[PDB]
Amino acid sequence: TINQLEEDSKILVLRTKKDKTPRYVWYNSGGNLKCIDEEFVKMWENVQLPQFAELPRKLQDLGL
């Protein structure tokens, strides 16, 4: 039932899939949403953060 109402409907913290998923207080709206492509999330991870307040320019530089 931790992952039965999954996608944060029943959220819990799987400490490991060998340790009965020792959880914390977990509840969210989307929560995981693993349907997002991991590579895209990796590509999302692949976005490197530039430096300081020039980044406030850099976002305006990037069209944000």
């Binding site: 914390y24 989307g30 530039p50 980044l55």
Partner: protein, 191 residues
């Protein structure tokens, strides 16, 4: 205020395109701005490899600028705690740029698109483009050979990329009602 939305928006992304446990470190240190590091560790009561990589994201996104909450120890010695003084502006600033970058991974990708212009000889496994083809074309062979392979070519990028980009378009749409809207919901005041 929007500050709650700021924390609210942080929860959404850290739960939209992040795992569930990502928001646990959010709320815990969101309870009190200047918080002792162990308190979150204590209440979660979890290992340091179940906390370390999560700490990575908090500073990898710079969302939790863990201020060295130095205290006055009773023994007259070193005292400090990782109190995540959230840098709300700077955190999102990269995020917006981060968002933009993935859109670039779609805004560029629009040219990787529907109708086939290039060619490729599978036998050499090497792509070619139109101008090569007409350069490689012949009065006799109305179709293309492959100087490397002497082999007829095949079109490319027709189905996959068109099909690909639409998928990310929805993924780009996946952020529309999400963060970007709520981001504009920050742009109302930009505090």
């Amino acid at each position: 205020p929007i500050d709650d939305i700021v924390k609210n928006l942080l929860k959404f992304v850290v739960r939209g395109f992040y795992g569930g446990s990502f928001v646990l470190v959010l709320d815990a240190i969101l309870f009190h701005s200047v918080l002792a590091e162990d308190d979150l560790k204590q209440l979660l009561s979890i290992n340091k490899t179940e906390l370390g990589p999560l700490i990575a994201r908090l500073r990898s996104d710079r969302l939790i600028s863990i201020h060295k909450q130095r205290e006055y120890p009773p023994n007259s010695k070193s005292v400090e705690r990782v109190y995540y003084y959230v840098k709300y502006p700077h955190a999102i600033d990269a995020i917006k740029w981060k968002v933009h970058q993935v859109v670039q991974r779609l805004k560029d990708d629009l040219d990787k698109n529907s109708e086939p212009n290039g060619y490729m000889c599978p036998i050499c496994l090497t792509k070619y483009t139109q101008l090569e083809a007409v350069q490689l074309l012949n009065f006799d062979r109305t179709e293309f050979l492959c100087s490397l392979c002497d082999e007829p070519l095949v079109e490319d990028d027709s189905g996959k990329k068109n099909k690909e980009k639409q998928d990310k378009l929805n993924r780009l749409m996946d952020q529309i009602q999400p963060i970007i809207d709520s981001l504009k919901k920050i742009d109302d005041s930009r505090i």
